[PDB]
């Protein structure tokens, strides 16, 4: 490569939104550095003290100029988790309305889990799919990570199911939209591993978008993923993701198809197929699914609906989807006279949200520990350098 | 406004004088990786995961950015406690420069001024800085090569007739005025700092002792700075109570430079180093000229005009009184057009890499905890954000 080439490859790396060394990523590195060094114990070191003094006024200017949490007026808290909360926000200046997901830095290190958010960030920021909730901005500070997404006023499928005894025609639509959405994620080289109605959001038109990609992972050369992670609510998780708690096994995308079948069973039956009072009881039923899977006597569920569920609720080796989406798509359950796969999101959804305003939260039910002072360099902000992201 | 905030923030990453431009930011991340990558520190998971996450990335950057291996070293032209200076050929561009290496370790045991002056003087009187870069061990300053060598070399191989001394003194006066105009006092003007270009014209290099003057063009410095034979009496006495001095201290050195060119020795030479300091202090009585019918009336006057106490020293009331001096009265050059004239010694060079005018020629321990040795050097890079 020529000197000019070398200069421009480097220049374009500072401008790339997908670059690990983008001006915002680099700015994080400096912001972290200042945060993790500014303590009386550490300032004893002159290299450290002079650096902080040199970058004092500068770092403050930057901190104020860059996107901060105070740029958003919080309209309502729409969701809440261990990590932190999800909230309907209005950007004070642009007066634009978004949904913002806050993740506690202390609560992530405390819990040891610090890497999921990278996948959630990447997926939402770069999917460029009608099936994925869009990330417009990602920013941070010493306490939280912030993800500014598009607001999905239709609420989640949990809310839909809780208000309706779903007819088969609706379930067919929602399952189809999910299959399409998951295929989109799979095409990006990702497996979700915990697909549930909580992750299924509805836009202003009643169409599906997947959100909350916290359990997402990039597939290896073989479209597989290993995992030494613990399970949180097994109800929708595949037997293989449970079978591999400790990294004792790789699994492919067919694990998400299992969750699809569960989603269908729940929409038509009214309960999940492996529910048990205790959490461990659910895990047992999932494991024993060959015998634990039963359908109620009311011949309400059609032949093809019962078949698709069982096609998905089997061991991976014989599970529908093992040979790609097309065998799922070809299933007779999806045989209809309302929509075509290639034009489904352009059709009229079964439940169209009637909204009062850009800030209507009717489809959402109504609903702080700090790091200690370091006695030596601990670098609490380092696992988050490069999380900042802006759109142009 | 949102768009103002975005703009202010964007203009800061582009500014060559900004503390947070691409150069500085890339320097920080590079410093962070360097100061953390040790087995003792990698015991910390926050630290180890960060390094692992940025491994391939940091290497790509390190390879893409200007590195020392991009230059083929042609010859070591100067050497110093600080480091070495070397004639280099940039392997790709095949372009020839002089590169000044400064040992980071040897410093922790001034370069910001040297960098700024050379990178932004935009003066024919100052050696040009094209690039500045670094690594874990050294700072690198890629400057234009001055093949005419230093005035020390000229003086050592010639007996300088008055007509030549007049030229070189004049070029120095102009060069120092340029530095002064930038708000700096050289504080160590010597023939070692005076380099000659391909045409035989002067350029000042090595601004190691340069200090920015205050509001009233003064400098409060509690410690002596410079070389023993050139140090002014005021910068020699420079202490707690005193400390305060102006640009007239460089004019003292100009007189020393003239005396040496014409006489052949410095005016306060003594066998011992301490003996020189004594003579400097007693400049009123120690300044003598040999029985030399060749040192003119006006040359002797200019020397004494400069080799006096600051209060009555030529230059106290600006350059124009130095310029107006009869010593500079001539029919060869005008001050305005002087660097456009033909120099008294025009270098006869064999190639772009001729080094004939140049005489022939450990780091930090491994940290047991975070010490941040690369932090005092974040921003030194002059590559991604330069003035054009
Ligand atoms: O992560 C979560 N929810 C999410 N909701 C949105 C969203 C909401 C509305 N409009 C666009 C996007 C994105 S992620 C979550 C997880 C566990 C517990 C509570 C939670 F709220
Ligand atoms: O700093 C020093 N020399 C310098 N030489 C140049 C230069 C040389 C050639 N062409 C352009 C520029 C720049 S600075 C020095 C000081 C003390 C001891 C040895 C040294 F080499």
From Swiss-Prot, chain A:
Subcellular location: Cytoplasm; Cytoplasm, Cytoskeleton, Microtubule organizing center, Centrosome, Centriole; Golgi apparatus membrane; Cell projection, Bleb
GO molecular function, a single term: tau-protein kinase activity
Active-site residue numbers: 194 (proton acceptor)
Record PTM text: Autophosphorylated on serine and threonine residues.
Tissue spec. comment: Detected in blood platelets.
Keyword RNA-binding: no
Record key words, sorted: Acetylation, Apoptosis, ATP-binding, Cell membrane, Cell projection, Coiled coil, Cytoplasm, Cytoskeleton, Golgi apparatus, Kinase, Magnesium, Membrane, Metal-binding, Nucleotide-binding, Phosphoprotein, Serine/threonine-protein kinase, Transferase, Zinc, Zinc-finger
GO terms classed as biological process: actin cytoskeleton organization; actomyosin structure organization; aortic valve morphogenesis; apical constriction; bleb assembly; blood vessel diameter maintenance; cortical actin cytoskeleton organization; embryonic morphogenesis
Stretch forming the signal peptide: none
Ranges of residues in domain Protein kinase: 72-334
Main location: cytoplasm
Domain of life: Eukaryota
Residues involved in ATP binding: 78-86, 101
Domain AGC-kinase C-terminal residues, every copy: 337-392
Any single GO CC term annotated in Swiss-Prot or TrEMBL for this entry: cytoskeleton
Domain commentary: The C-terminal auto-inhibitory domain interferes with kinase activity. RHOA binding leads to a conformation change and activation of the kinase. Truncated ROCK1 is constitutively activated.
Protein family membership: Belongs to the protein kinase superfamily. AGC Ser/Thr protein kinase family.
Quaternary structure and partners: Homodimer. Interacts with RHOB, RHOC, MYLC2B and PTEN. Interacts with ITGB1BP1 (via N-terminus and PTB domain). Interacts with RHOA (activated by GTP), CHORDC1, DAPK3, GEM, JIP3, RHOE, PPP1R12A, PFN1, LIMK1, LIMK2 and TSG101. Interacts with FHOD1 in a Src-dependent manner. Interacts with SHROOM3.
Functional note: Protein kinase which is a key regulator of the actin cytoskeleton and cell polarity. Involved in regulation of smooth muscle contraction, actin cytoskeleton organization, stress fiber and focal adhesion formation, neurite retraction, cell adhesion and motility via phosphorylation of DAPK3, GFAP, LIMK1, LIMK2, MYL9/MLC2, TPPP, PFN1 and PPP1R12A. Phosphorylates FHOD1 and acts synergistically with it to promote SRC-dependent non-apoptotic plasma membrane blebbing. Phosphorylates JIP3 and regulates the recruitment of JNK to JIP3 upon UVB-induced stress.
Protein name according to UniProt: Rho-associated protein kinase 1
Organism: Homo sapiens
Gene, per the UniProt record: ROCK1
Residues shown, of full length: 6 to 402 of 1354
